CSV table of C-alpha atoms in Angstrom, one decimal:
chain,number,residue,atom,x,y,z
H,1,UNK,CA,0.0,0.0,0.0
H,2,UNK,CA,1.1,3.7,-0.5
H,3,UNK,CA,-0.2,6.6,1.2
H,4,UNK,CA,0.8,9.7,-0.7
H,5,UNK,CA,1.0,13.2,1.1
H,6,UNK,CA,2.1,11.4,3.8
H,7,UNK,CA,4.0,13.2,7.4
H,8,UNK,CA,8.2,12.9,6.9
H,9,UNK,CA,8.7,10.5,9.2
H,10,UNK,CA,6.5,8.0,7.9
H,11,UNK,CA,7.6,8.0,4.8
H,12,UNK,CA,10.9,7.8,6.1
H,13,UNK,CA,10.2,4.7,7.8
H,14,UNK,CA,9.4,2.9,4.8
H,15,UNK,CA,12.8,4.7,2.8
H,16,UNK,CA,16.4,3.6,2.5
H,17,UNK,CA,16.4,7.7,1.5
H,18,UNK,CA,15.6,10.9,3.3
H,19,UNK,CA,13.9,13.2,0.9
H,20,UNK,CA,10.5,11.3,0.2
H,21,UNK,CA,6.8,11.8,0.7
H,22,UNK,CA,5.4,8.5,0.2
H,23,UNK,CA,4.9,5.9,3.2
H,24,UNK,CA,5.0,2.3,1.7
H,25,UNK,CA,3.1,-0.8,3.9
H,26,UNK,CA,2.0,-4.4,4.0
H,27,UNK,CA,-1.8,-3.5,3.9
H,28,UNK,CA,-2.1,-5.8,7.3
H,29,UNK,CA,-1.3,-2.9,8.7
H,30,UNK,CA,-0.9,-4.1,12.4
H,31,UNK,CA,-4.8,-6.0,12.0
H,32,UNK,CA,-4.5,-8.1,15.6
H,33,UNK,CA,-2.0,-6.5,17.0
H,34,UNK,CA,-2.8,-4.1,20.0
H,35,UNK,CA,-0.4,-0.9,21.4
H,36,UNK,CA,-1.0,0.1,24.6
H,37,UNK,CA,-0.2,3.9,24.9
H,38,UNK,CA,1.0,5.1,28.5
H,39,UNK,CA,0.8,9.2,28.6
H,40,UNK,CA,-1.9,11.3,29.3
H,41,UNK,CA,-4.7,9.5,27.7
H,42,UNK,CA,-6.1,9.2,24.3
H,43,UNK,CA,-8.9,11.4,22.7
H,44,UNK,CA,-10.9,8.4,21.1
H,45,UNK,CA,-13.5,10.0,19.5
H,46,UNK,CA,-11.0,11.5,17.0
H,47,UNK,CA,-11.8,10.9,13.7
H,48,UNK,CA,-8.7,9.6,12.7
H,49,UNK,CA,-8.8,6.8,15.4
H,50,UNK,CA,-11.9,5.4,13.6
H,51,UNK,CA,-13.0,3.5,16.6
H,52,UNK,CA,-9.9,1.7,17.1
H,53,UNK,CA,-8.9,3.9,20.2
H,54,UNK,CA,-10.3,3.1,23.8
H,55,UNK,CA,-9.0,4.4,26.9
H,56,UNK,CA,-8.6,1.1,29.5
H,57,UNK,CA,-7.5,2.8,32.7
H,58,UNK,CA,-7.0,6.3,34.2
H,59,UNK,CA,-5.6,7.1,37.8
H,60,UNK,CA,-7.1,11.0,37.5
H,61,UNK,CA,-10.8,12.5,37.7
H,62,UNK,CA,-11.3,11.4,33.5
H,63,UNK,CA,-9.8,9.2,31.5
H,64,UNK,CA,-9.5,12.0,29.1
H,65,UNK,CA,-6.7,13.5,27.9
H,66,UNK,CA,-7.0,17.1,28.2
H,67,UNK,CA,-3.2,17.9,26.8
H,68,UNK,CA,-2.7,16.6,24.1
H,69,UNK,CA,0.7,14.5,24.2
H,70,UNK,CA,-0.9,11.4,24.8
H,71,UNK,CA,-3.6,12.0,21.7
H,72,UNK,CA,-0.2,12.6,19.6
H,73,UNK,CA,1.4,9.9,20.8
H,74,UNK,CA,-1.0,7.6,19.8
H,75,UNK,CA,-1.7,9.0,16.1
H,76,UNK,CA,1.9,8.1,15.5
H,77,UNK,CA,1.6,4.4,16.6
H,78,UNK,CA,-1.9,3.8,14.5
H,79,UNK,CA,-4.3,6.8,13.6
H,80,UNK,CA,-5.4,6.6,9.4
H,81,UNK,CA,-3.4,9.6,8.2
H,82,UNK,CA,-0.6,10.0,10.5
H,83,UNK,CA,0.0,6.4,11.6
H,84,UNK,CA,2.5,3.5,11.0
H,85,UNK,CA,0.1,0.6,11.5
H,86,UNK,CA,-3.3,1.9,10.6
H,87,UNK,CA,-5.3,-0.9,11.8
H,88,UNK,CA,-3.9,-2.0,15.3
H,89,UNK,CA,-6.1,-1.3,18.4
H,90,UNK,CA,-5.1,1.4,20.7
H,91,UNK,CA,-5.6,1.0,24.9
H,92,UNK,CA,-5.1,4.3,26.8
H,93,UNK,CA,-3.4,4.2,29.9
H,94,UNK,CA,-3.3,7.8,31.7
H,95,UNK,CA,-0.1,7.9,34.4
H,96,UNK,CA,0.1,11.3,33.3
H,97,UNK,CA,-2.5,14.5,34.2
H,98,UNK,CA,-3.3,16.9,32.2
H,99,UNK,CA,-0.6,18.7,32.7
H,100,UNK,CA,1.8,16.4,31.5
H,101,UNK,CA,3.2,15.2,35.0
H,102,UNK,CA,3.3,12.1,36.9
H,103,UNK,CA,4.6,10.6,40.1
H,104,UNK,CA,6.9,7.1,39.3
H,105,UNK,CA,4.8,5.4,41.7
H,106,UNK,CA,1.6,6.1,38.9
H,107,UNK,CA,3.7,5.0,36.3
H,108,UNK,CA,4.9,1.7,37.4
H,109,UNK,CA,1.5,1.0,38.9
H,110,UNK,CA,0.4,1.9,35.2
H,111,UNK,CA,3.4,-0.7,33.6
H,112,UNK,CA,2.1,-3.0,36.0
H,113,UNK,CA,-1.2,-2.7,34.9
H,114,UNK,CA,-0.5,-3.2,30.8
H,115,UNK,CA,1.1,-6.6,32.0
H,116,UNK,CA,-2.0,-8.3,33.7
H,117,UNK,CA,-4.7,-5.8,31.1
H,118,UNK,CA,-3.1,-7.8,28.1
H,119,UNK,CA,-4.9,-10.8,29.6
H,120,UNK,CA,-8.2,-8.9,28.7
H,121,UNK,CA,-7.9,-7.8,25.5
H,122,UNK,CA,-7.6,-9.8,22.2
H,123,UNK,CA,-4.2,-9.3,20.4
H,124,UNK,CA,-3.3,-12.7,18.3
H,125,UNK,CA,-0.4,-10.6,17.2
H,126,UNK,CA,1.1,-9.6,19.6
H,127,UNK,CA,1.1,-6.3,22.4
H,128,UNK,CA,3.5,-3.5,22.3
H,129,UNK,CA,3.9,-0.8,24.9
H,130,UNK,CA,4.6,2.6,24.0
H,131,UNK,CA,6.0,5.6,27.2
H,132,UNK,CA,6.6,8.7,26.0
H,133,UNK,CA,8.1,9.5,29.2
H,134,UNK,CA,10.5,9.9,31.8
H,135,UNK,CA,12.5,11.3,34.5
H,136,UNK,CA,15.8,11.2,36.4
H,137,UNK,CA,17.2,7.6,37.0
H,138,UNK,CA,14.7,5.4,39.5
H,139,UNK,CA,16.0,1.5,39.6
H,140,UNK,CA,12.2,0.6,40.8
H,141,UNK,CA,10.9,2.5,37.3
H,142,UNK,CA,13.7,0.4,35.3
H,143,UNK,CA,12.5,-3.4,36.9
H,144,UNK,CA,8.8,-2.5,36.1
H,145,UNK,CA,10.0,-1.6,32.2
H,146,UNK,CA,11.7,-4.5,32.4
H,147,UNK,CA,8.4,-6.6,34.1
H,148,UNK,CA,6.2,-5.3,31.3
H,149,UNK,CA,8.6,-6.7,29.0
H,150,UNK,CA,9.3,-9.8,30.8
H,151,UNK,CA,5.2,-10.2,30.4
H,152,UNK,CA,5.2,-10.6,26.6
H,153,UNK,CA,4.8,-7.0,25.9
H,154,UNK,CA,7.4,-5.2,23.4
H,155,UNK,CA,8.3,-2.0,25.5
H,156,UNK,CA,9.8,1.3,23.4
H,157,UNK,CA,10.8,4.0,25.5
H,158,UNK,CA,11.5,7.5,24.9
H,159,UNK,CA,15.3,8.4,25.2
H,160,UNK,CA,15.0,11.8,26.3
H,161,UNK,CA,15.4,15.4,25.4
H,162,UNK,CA,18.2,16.4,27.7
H,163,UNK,CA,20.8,16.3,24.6
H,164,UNK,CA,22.4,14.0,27.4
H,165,UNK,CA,23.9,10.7,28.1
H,166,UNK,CA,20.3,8.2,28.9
H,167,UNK,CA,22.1,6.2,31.3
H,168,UNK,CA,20.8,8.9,33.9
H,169,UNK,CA,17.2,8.3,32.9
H,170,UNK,CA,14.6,5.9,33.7
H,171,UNK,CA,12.7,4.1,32.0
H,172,UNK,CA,15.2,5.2,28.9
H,173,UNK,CA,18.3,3.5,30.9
H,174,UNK,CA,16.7,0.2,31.1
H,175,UNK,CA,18.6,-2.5,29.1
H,176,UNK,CA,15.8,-4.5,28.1
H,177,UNK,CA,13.5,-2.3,27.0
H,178,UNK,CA,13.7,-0.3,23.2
H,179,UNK,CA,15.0,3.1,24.0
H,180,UNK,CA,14.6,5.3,21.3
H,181,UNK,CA,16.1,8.7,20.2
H,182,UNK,CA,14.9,11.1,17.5
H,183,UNK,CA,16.1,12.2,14.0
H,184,UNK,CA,14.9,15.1,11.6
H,185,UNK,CA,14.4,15.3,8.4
H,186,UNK,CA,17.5,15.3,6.8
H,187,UNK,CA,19.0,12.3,8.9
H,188,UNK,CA,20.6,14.4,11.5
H,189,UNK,CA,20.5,13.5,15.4
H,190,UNK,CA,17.8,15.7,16.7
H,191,UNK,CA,19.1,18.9,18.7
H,192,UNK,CA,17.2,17.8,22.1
H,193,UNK,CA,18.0,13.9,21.1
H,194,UNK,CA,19.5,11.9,24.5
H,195,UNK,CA,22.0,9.6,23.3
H,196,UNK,CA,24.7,6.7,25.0
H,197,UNK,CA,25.1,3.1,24.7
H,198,UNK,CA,21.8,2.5,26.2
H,199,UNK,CA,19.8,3.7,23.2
H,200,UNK,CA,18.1,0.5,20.7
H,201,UNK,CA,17.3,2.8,17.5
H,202,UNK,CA,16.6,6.3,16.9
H,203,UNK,CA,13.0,7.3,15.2
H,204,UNK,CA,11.5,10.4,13.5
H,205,UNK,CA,11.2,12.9,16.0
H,206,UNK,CA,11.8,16.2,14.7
H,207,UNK,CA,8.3,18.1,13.1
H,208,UNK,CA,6.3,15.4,13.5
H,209,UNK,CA,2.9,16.0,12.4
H,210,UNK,CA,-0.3,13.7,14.2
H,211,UNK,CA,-3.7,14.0,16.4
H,212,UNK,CA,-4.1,16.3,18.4
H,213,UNK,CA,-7.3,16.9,21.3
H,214,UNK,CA,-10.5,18.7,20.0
H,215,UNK,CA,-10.4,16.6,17.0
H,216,UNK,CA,-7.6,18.7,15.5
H,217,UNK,CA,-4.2,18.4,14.2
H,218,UNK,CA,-0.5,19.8,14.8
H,219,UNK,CA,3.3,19.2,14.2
H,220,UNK,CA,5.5,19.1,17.3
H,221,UNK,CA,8.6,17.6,18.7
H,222,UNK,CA,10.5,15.5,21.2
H,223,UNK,CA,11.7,11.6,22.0
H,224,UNK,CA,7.8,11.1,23.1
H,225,UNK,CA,7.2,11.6,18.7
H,226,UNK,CA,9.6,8.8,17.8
H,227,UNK,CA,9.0,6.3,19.9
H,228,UNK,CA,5.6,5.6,19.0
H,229,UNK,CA,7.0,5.1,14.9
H,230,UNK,CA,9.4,2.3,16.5
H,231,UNK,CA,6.1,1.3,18.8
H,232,UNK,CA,3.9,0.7,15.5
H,233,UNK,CA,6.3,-0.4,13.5
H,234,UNK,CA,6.8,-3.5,16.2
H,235,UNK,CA,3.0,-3.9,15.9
H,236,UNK,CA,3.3,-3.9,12.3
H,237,UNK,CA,5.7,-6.2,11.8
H,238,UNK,CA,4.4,-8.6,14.4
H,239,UNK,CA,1.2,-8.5,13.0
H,240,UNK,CA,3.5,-9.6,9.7
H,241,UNK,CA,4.6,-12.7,11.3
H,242,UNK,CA,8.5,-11.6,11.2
H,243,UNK,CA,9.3,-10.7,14.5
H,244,UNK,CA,7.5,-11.1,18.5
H,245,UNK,CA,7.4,-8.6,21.3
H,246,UNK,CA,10.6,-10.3,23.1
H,247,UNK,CA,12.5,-9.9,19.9
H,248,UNK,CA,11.5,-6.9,18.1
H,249,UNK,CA,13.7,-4.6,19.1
H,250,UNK,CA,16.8,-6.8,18.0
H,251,UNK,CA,15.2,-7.2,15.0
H,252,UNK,CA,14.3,-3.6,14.0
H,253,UNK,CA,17.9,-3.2,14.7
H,254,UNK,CA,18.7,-5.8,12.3
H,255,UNK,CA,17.1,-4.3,9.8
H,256,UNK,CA,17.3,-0.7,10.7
H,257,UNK,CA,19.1,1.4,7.6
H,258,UNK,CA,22.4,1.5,9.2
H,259,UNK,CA,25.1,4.4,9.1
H,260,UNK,CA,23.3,7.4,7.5
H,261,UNK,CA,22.4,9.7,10.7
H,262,UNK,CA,24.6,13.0,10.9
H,263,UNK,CA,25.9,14.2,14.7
H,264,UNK,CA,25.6,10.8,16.1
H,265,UNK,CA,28.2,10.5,19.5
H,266,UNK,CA,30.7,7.7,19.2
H,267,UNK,CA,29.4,4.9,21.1
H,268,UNK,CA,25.7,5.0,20.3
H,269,UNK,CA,23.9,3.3,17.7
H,270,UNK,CA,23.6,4.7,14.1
H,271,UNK,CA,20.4,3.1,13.3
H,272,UNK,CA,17.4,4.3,12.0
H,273,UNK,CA,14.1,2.5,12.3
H,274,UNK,CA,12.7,0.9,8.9
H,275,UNK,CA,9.8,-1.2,8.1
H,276,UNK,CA,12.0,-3.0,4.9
H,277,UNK,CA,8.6,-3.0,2.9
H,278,UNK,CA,9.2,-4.0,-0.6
H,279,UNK,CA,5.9,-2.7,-2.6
């Protein structure tokens, strides 16, 4: 399938070049996988979510999210225009309030939850697990990234956007989750991008155009935007057949065009995430 028009970083996803419009996909399109998104909730009555967006669990006054990031989040991972896998179901999880902020307590109770929820939900494919988030290092916040993975659920993590070394961070500093940094346009480390040995794979983060609350639309930046790209892109190819949630993330750096990002420190991972979808 081709979507023309499509946002940068999908099209990039699907590109052994920068420079293209196009986003190229197995028309399974992540159909029975499912992508839990942990953040500040999920406005499912968008449009673009089609009714494949439910929010599961909230530990605020509403389940809805009235910021924003989490709604972004999520149109990255599976919405119809600015998605990677366009036909996975999306489970809100809100550890985050509306203001964007959350104590690590309400996030590993929420990593905790994804673990047992999966049990409820119907994903023959596979379940991925996408937090846009983070803070300073927190060994407790690491071992429940690394429980949610343990469960059967492939876990990408945001890197960070202290242009700093992720070791410091949590859940970014775990070693067996996906930790993800971000890249523009033209294949260059983005300016806030955390980096170190700790990061997996680096994904479109720079500009990134998806949902946004009251049904709207708008291009913004950070970690948070590329990790859900490498969190559909795990649904997708699971949902393919080629890859499961414990393995994924070795195997999108298997495949991962290899090399071509600009200002990348020595010692971390010149990878760029990549579907390898021959039309």
């Amino acid at each position: 399938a081709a979507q023309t028009n499509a946002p940068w970083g999908l099209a990039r996803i699907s590109s052994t070049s920068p420079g293209t419009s196009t986003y190229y996909y197995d028309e399974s399109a992540g159909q029975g996988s499912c992508v839990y998104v942990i953040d500040t909730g999920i406005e499912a009555s968008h449009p673009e979510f089609e009714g494949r967006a439910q929010m599961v669990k909230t530990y605020y006054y509403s389940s809805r999210d009235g910021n924003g990031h989490g709604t972004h989040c999520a149109g990255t991972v599976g919405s119809r225009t600015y998605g990677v896998a366009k036909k996975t179901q999306l489970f809100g999880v809100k550890v985050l309030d509306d203001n964007g902020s959350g104590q690590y307590s309400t996030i590993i109770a929420g990593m905790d939850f994804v673990a047992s929820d999966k049990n409820n939900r119907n994903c023959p494919k596979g379940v991925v697990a996408s937090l846009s988030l983070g803070g300073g290092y927190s060994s407790s916040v690491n071992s429940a990234a690394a429980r949610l993975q343990s469960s059967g659920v492939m876990v990408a993590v945001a890197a960070g956007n202290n242009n700093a070394d992720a070791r410091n961070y949590s859940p970014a500093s775990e070693p067996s989750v996906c930790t993800v940094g971000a890249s523009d346009r033209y294949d260059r480390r983005s300016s806030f991008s955390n980096y170190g040995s700790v990061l997996d794979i680096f994904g479109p983060g720079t500009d990134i155009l998806s949902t946004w609350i009251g049904g709207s639309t708008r291009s913004i930046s950070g970690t948070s935007m590329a990790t859900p790209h490498v969190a559909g892109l795990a649904a997708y190819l699971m949902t393919l057949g080629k890859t499961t949630a414990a393995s994924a993330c070795r195997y999108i750096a298997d495949t991962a065009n290899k090399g071509d990002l600009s200002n990348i420190p020595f010692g971390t991972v010149n990878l760029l995430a990549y579907n390898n979808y021959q039309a």
